[PDB]
Amino acid sequence: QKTPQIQVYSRHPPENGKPNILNCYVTQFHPPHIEIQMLKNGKKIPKVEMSDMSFSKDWSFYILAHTEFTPTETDTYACRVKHASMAEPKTVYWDR
Amino acid sequence: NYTFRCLQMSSFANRSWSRTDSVVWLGDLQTHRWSNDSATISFTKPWSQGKLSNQQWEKLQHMFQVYRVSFTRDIQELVKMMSPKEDYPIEIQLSAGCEMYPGNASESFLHVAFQGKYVVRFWGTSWQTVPGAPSWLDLPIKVLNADQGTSATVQMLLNDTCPLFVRGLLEAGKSDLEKQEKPVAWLSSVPSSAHGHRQLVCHVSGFYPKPVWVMWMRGDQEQQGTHRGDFLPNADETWYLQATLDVEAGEEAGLACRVKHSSLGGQDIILYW
Ligand SMILES: CCCCCCCC(=O)N[C@@H](CO[C@H]1O[C@H](CO)[C@H](O)[C@H](O)[C@H]1O)[C@H](O)[C@H](O)CCCCCCCCCCCCc1ccccc1
Ligand SMILES: *[C@@H]1O[C@H](CO)[C@@H](O[C@@H]2O[C@H](CO)[C@@H](O)[C@H](O)[C@H]2NC(C)=O)[C@H](O)[C@H]1NC(C)=O
Ligand SMILES: CCCCCCCCCCCCCCCC(=O)O
Ligand SMILES: *[C@@H]1O[C@H](CO)[C@@H](O)[C@H](O)[C@H]1NC(C)=O
Ligand SMILES: *[C@@H]1O[C@H](CO)[C@@H](O)[C@H](O)[C@H]1NC(C)=O
Numbered sequence: 001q002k003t004p005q006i007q008v009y010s011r012h013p014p015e016n017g018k019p020n021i022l023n024c025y026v027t028q029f030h031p032p033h034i035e036i037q038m039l040k041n042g043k044k045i046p047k048v049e050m051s052d053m054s055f056s057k058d059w060s061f062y063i064l065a066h067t068e069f070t071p072t073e074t075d076t077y078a079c080r081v082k083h084a085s086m087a088e089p090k091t092v093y094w095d096r
Numbered sequence: 097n098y099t100f101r102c103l104q105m106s107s108f109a110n111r112s113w114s115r116t117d118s119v120v121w122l123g124d125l126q127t128h129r130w131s132n133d134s135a136t137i138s139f140t141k142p143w144s145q146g147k148l149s150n151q152q153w154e155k156l157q158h159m160f161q162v163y164r165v166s167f168t169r170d171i172q173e174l175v176k177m178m179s180p181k182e183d184y185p186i187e188i189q190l191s192a193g194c195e196m197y198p199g200n201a202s203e204s205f206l207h208v209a210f211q212g213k214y215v216v217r218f219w220g221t222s223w224q225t226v227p228g229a230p231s232w233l234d235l236p237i238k239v240l241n242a243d244q245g246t247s248a249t250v251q252m253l254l255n256d257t258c259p260l261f262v263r264g265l266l267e268a269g270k271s272d273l274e275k276q277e278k279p280v281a282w283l284s285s286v287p288s289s290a291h292g293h294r295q296l297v298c299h300v301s302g303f304y305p306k307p308v309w310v311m312w313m314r315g316d317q318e319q320q321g322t323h324r325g326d327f328l329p330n331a332d333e334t335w336y337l338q339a340t341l342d343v344e345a346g347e348e349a350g351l352a353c354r355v356k357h358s359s360l361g362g363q364d365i366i367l368y369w
Contacts, residue, residue: 009328011301012301023329025329031185049331054119059209096284
């Protein structure tokens, strides 16, 4: 059983009011069953796109979640992961 | 020099529930997906059939369709043999393909992991357990090695089909495999884990292919505190990388981030903090 690592990053330089894409890349987990949520101001974002799950040369799994967003000054974004390796969900905030 | 890999992920939760899903990569570009829910293998590029005719592709696909059903049945039966020695959940991963060396050369591989650990490979003409694999696998592997039809098919796939197919992919997918996409960079800062410091971040996004150079600079002097992160995928088949630098309060002035990439034609991006 291996714990997921989570990285959150934008596709383009963030400019308030300009459309962008926020990425949540989740790696190093096992087994492959997992739940990934992207959050805006603590609320689940509905239309989040998921890549096909895959795995590395070391056999650990990875997957990319992403969503269209338009950042503002005061919106906070995060990615929250539930997996059997962790009793509690793991959240990482976008650094902005 | 390209690694072609077919990645199979099979999960068995109990005697009733299982699924198998595969993805296929040529280098870092995905060429196929085959979901458990789909009868047929899906192309994720216009060129994913390579140079094979529809007849040849269909023969290949039919062979894989038979394999997927057979593998599932076999695993749930070959459980009961050494079970409840072992039992559910069971996770199996298979990585098979070939690496296309300079000129005419290629080497093929077929590796299998059980519960996230490498245990079995196909080698030459037979299945073998790797040293340190659980001893209970020896009997299932003997049973598999008695199936000469399977052995001959796997030998064909590794020795003949893999390099054949990949030559055709490389020709058919030339413009995508050789695509050049430009990085765009930006600077930000975040909290440091060290007191008295801030972490400067140089973000580089949208570049293809992977190889890239990113360094914090003070004039011509490379800043050896530069900490390069991992290559992270964007959803549009480009890459993201950030390089960080922990710097003392009021040491920020004069710092720049410099980015070199094949797509820029010798014309580096330089951003000043
Ligand atoms: C990437 C592998 C490609 C193999 C596909 C071609 C062979 C195939 O599909 N074989 C099937 C059925 O074969 C029959 O029909 C065949 C033709 O139609 C022949 O006529 C052949 O002579 C019959 O026997 C066969 O059932 C194979 O056994 C399918 C599974 C082979 C995959 C071997 C995977 C190795 C798994 C090791 C897992 C180790 C961990 C583990 C083991 C056991 C339990 C739990 C975990
Ligand atoms: C597929 O290629 C392998 C090459 O590794 C062949 O296996 C070798 O076969 C020779 C005889 O031709 C044996 O002496 C070697 O010991 C085998 N090599 C290994 C590493 O075991 C295999 O015969 C080929 N199969 C087909 C159908 O072409
Ligand atoms: C042993 C595989 C190597 C040879 C493959 C050459 C033909 C390309 C096949 C592409 C479709 C991928 C099928 C995935 C099936 C699976 O692994 O479960
Ligand atoms: C089998 O596994 C599935 C998925 O984990 C689960 O929904 C179901 O409860 C299990 N069934 C039995 C009979 O154990
Ligand atoms: C996977 O596909 C098989 C064969 O079509 C099917 O019987 C099975 O229910 C699928 N598994 C899941 C979890 O949907």
